Design a protein around this ligand. Structure first.
Ligand SMILES: Nc1ncnc2c1ncn2[C@@H]1O[C@H](COP(=O)(O)OP(=O)(O)OP(=O)(O)O)[C@@H](O)[C@H]1O
Ligand SMILES: Nc1ncnc2c1ncn2[C@@H]1O[C@H](COP(=O)(O)OP(=O)(O)OP(=O)(O)O)[C@@H](O)[C@H]1O
Ligand SMILES: Nc1ncnc2c1ncn2[C@@H]1O[C@H](COP(=O)(O)OP(=O)(O)OP(=O)(O)O)[C@@H](O)[C@H]1O
Ligand SMILES: Nc1ncnc2c1ncn2[C@@H]1O[C@H](COP(=O)(O)OP(=O)(O)OP(=O)(O)O)[C@@H](O)[C@H]1O
Ligand SMILES: Nc1ncnc2c1ncn2[C@@H]1O[C@H](COP(=O)(O)OP(=O)(O)OP(=O)(O)O)[C@@H](O)[C@H]1O
Ligand SMILES: Nc1ncnc2c1ncn2[C@@H]1O[C@H](COP(=O)(O)OP(=O)(O)OP(=O)(O)O)[C@@H](O)[C@H]1O
Ligand SMILES: Nc1ncnc2c1ncn2[C@@H]1O[C@H](COP(=O)(O)OP(=O)(O)OP(=O)(O)O)[C@@H](O)[C@H]1O
Ligand SMILES: Nc1ncnc2c1ncn2[C@@H]1O[C@H](COP(=O)(O)OP(=O)(O)OP(=O)(O)O)[C@@H](O)[C@H]1O
Ligand SMILES: [Cs+]
Ligand SMILES: [Cs+]
Ligand SMILES: [Cs+]
Ligand SMILES: [Cs+]
Ligand SMILES: [Mg+2]
Ligand SMILES: [Mg+2]
Ligand SMILES: [Mg+2]
Ligand SMILES: [Mg+2]
Ligand SMILES: [Mg+2]
Ligand SMILES: [Mg+2]
Ligand SMILES: [Mg+2]
Ligand SMILES: [Mg+2]
Lengths: 308, 309, 308, 309
């Protein structure tokens, strides 16, 4: 099986804390936080480890927070390839409210990258051998021009690196600008922004996904639909996969779990149907767990057997 | 096509109001409320009218609020058959918050019913002709023992009335104890309570629905699954229908819209597939509208054509 | 001691209910409500009963909800004088959320009054003997022109009825338009709207209250200041009374409790200082109780002894 | 006038961000944060600068966040004396919600301190000259036994350093076990915990404060009462000062502003009355500003002149 790498230009060291109630104005006293790795490509690599594969996370790390992020990944046996950055690795906050069981997630931008740190990141990307898979996932941090992202993807593709993209906004449009992306996973809002129109008719999501494939921007578009599962589109096929009717506990990590699973199937040269089913299995398996926990192998396997 | 009736033991006159912000402790200044008909069977009858059918809503009404409830339905050209009750028709509250666009729904019990009044409602039901359809939908109000609900449904079936049930808790178990219910529509929570186990495995919902059909409790069970659509089960068939991937504006009225649609299909002697498809079409069409608005005919048709393509 | 009456043109039959959590979109299942009398003058009369006095509540009542409102007051031994109205007595909602201990209060307008029902209400007001006290408190319902309120107050004053006013907005301005009001109790926001300017300097509240007295609109202005107590102003005196440093549990009914207490002191021809102190004692005593419960005699007495 | 120092065992580099709405489950997109100095003693020193005085903030700083904390204070011309700590300076989060204008404050513990680092902080404190003032303010970080806080304050007093304490829980009890504290500023909750009883009667707060003075634990106790101002107690005097009736915009920084003000008055050997008046003036001036902004000189002066009229 081909090697798998992920790229996260905006990683984070996330804090998970607990407080008894939520209300404005006053000080909410929060428990000592539990630190967890954060960022699109980093979580894709973690999900892949859970599913029994291996993926190397490429990312910039800065300061004590960056060192702790790398430390956490080592304890999870997730291989990494890091670039030391000047700006310190930023922190997002996950707050669990005990009285209500609700969770609040505050997502701020990643640390800045200068031109030289991005150059070093691109250097690590181009050390990846031909045929191997690269998952570019997450937001675009300050300090990086959009064209630099497109140029990185072009350079990767020129030497046979197979690129998978999961992002949003201008970053997503830019990653698809040159085209020939192997797989892209917009959710519904992300798809709507990408094709720049509202998707209000029953057939709109399918047609918008097909329009992306037909343009040559992506060979495979998997539109993820939250509890409705996903719609996968090829030049030859359109497949909708709906999760089993089991209550979601928490949706955190659903997208990254789905992406890790589909990446593994892509690495196996699986059918589109098998890929999307395994993606829905993993994304929905992720929901079965409280808080930030990612998909487990056993839950994904069980849901996949049901979908099959 | 047969006549359709609905029964709502706990109707309400609902107030819908607007306020700029929501926070505790202080007085939230709310706009003069707009009043709307409330209650399971009442809303099923309203959805049926939106879909071009006709259904008579049977319910207790009391006091000035009850009079207004009745007046509102006449304005909507929904036929009613009412029993005057001693306890005044109760009110639920729907609050739209301007700053967030969020809606809050405070659902309180229906007015009390005494034994005489329930017997009067029973009398109305038994005036329904054989072969007609009766949809019993909504909560059980104070004053009514569960054994009386069982007796009403049993009495109604004795003379060829085809009963459809949508309820929850002990009222749903009581309504199904008789058996031979034409159709029951539990959502996932209601199904879990009905079979008294958590449904945590992928096939649990289907197996639970089949268990109800196989035991003889219901001829058809449609488990509605929110954005996932519905799973319909017969002695012969099992199907899941998922709605198209369109954004839900508001979920209020989804269940009652779905039940109204399935009831119309049942009246037409439709297949299980056609019935569940029309049900999901109507339920999901309801979601396309803001606030409490029920499914519209055109939106339901558009989704159904898609599901039928 | 002189007789005391209250007038409530917009009464309500309030529902108090409990639900385990609060969140939007879904159905919040609420317990069978406990019904309680509502409306400014009605609650002033209830507070007066708690403090050991007697006040007759004048108000319109309509439908089964109106009958239950009258029924509740009878069980509280609060004497009433009612006018049967066509429009049914409206309902406000008090929601207690079990998980957080928070309470949410949704206040909607009162029922409409037609010209003839208002005429009957005015008739009951003018049956009040000279020297007796009338507390006009609460919002103005639909169907009643502002001038009708001012004309009612004028007619009352012409036959020696001593008027106390607690209201807001255009209704408050109108009640003060003719002047010679015995006592008015705006809170800070209400004062600001009345004098039509923002009160941002340390001395502004005092000066605004004094400006009302000096204009002849009111003989006594007591500006209530929430946890800061109240500032009472006369032609000869300015007195600030601050409550004791005890935690407030719920603020519901604080204003009406204060008004009932000050009304009783006014009926006793008490000093301004004694009046304001007893008002703060009752308002703050009200806060000591959870939910909607009004001031108790024993708590008010205890706080009054402290203030003295 | 004597030199003023502050000690913050649990400093922070706080992030202030903005988001349009607050709701659970979904990702809330927050703006790139503005960083601000955090911590009790640190904020006391900042308020002192706003009021025209000078105070040296002593604290542990670690990692890049600690470097930024130090850099921010230098930009504000607040003198510091720091100990480099192994554990990186922690971050609290202040979230402004645009739709409601509300602010949410998530307060997490400070970075850990080992025994060596605390001894280094102790060394800094004992370099303070006799007769100077030290304000110990804020929470106790992980890694520090309560007996070490008691020892530091005892050691500091042994050589004429005048200690002012603002803290909570066991750290406050520990800080007062020594006795002869120049000034303590509990709020109502902190006072209740300190004397270990609910303060439910009108005179309970005054009696509790007097009990602390009379036992010798503190020379002055100022119980701060939020919008009700403060009650100040001496062996000789007892006074309550209530702020003017002006609307509070935001309460963040009220306590630290009040402590900074009272500290400056203590340095000037002011009367209890003048000290508490200036304290309430500064605390209430702080409330006049949005978000985290501390008291300003002019607003504090205006309120103080009013209180002094
Ligand atoms: N359970 C609650 N629900 C809603 N608001 C609350 C709640 N608890 C506190 N608040 C709000 O927070 C403000 C202050 O709360 P609190 O008593 O915790 O003081 P604080 O300043 O946050 O903390 P501290 O005791 O450390 O000084 C109150 O004025 C109130 O507005
Ligand atoms: N409420 C849910 N119930 C069941 N499965 C879910 C639910 N939400 C997400 N999933 C599963 O997770 C997959 C991906 O989630 P989703 O479509 O929300 O993508 P996403 O918005 O990119 O995720 P994320 O917010 O984590 O980045 C879905 O296709 C589905 O399989
Ligand atoms: N916009 C708001 N956001 C959060 N809390 C608020 C807001 N407005 C008011 N509150 C809370 O409600 C309490 C009272 O608010 P408000 O000024 O509206 O007084 P009120 O008693 O509700 O109304 P009224 O002016 O009729 O007396 C405040 O002390 C505050 O805690
Ligand atoms: N979020 C949604 N998106 C799309 N369709 C929906 C959504 N929620 C409900 N529906 C549609 O409405 C039908 C019924 O809704 P649901 O399964 O939630 O039943 P319910 O809980 O009984 O409704 P209710 O709460 O109104 O009584 C669904 O099967 C589906 O067709
Ligand atoms: N504890 C909660 N916190 C936040 N939101 C919730 C919570 N519980 C339910 N909701 C919201 O309410 C919606 C539906 O909740 P629920 O399962 O109670 O169904 P319902 O339509 O309100 O009632 P029913 O079971 O009678 O059909 C959910 O989609 C969710 O958005
Ligand atoms: N948080 C509080 N703590 C202590 N006492 C209070 C508090 N709030 C109100 N009071 C007491 O109640 C009196 C009146 O309350 P307030 O100034 O809020 O008037 P109000 O806004 O007209 O009341 P309401 O909202 O009930 O109509 C105050 O003067 C004070 O004595
Ligand atoms: N404006 C809102 N009000 C209340 N709840 C919301 C709101 N927006 C989103 N939610 C809740 O958060 C969940 C996800 O919202 P959203 O569309 O932002 O997806 P997301 O996972 O947070 O972000 P993303 O697009 O990056 O995947 C929704 O299912 C809904 O329950
Ligand atoms: N809502 C308010 N209105 C007016 N002044 C206030 C208000 N809150 C606080 N203050 C002023 O600030 C001083 C200190 O505030 P407080 O009594 O709340 O102390 P604290 O709880 O220790 O503050 P903090 O939460 O910041 O640590 C008060 O004595 C008072 O002067
Ligand atoms: Cs999860
Ligand atoms: Cs709707
Ligand atoms: Cs109360
Ligand atoms: Cs502030
Ligand atoms: Mg995603
Ligand atoms: Mg998402
Ligand atoms: Mg339902
Ligand atoms: Mg539902
Ligand atoms: Mg008031
Ligand atoms: Mg008020
Ligand atoms: Mg404090
Ligand atoms: Mg405080």
């Amino acid at each position: 099986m081909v090697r798998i790498y992920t790229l996260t230009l905006a990683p984070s060291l996330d804090s998970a804390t607990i407080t008894p109630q939520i209300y404005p104005e006053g000080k909410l006293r929060c428990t000592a936080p539990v630190f967890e790795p954060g960022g699109g490509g980093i979580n894709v690599a973690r999900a892949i480890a859970h599913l029994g594969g291996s993926a190397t996370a490429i990312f910039p790390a800065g300061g004590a927070t960056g060192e702790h992020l790398v430390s956490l990944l080592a304890d999870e046996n997730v291989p990494v390839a890091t670039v030391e950055a000047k700006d310190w690795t930023r922190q997002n906050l996950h707050v669990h409210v005990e009285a209500s069981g609700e969770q609040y997630r505050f997502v701020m931008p990643g640390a800045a990258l200068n031109e030289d740190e991005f150059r070093q990141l691109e250097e690590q990307v181009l050390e990846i051998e031909s045929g191997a898979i690269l998952v570019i996932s997450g937001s675009l941090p300050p300090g990086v021009k959009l064209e630099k992202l497109t140029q990185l993807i072009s350079a990767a593709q020129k030497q046979g690196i197979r690129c998978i993209v999961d992002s949003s906004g201008e970053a997503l449009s830019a990653a698809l600008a040159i085209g020939n992306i192997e797989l892209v996973k917009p959710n519904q809002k992300e798809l709507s922004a990408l094709v720049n129109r509202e998707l209000t008719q029953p057939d709109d999501v399918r047609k918008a996904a097909q329009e992306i494939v037909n343009s040559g921007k992506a060979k495979r578009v998997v539109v993820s639909l939250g509890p409705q599962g996903a719609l996968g589109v090829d030049s030859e096929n359109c497949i909708q996969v709906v999760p089993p009717p089991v209550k979601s506990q928490s949706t955190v990590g659903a997208g990254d779990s789905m992406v890790g699973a589909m990446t593994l199937k892509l690495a196996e040269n699986a059918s589109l149907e098998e890929m999307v089913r395994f993606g829905v299995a993993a994304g929905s398996a992720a929901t079965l767990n409280q808080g930030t926990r990612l998909c487990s192998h056993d839950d994904t396997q069980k849901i996949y057997a049901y979908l099959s």
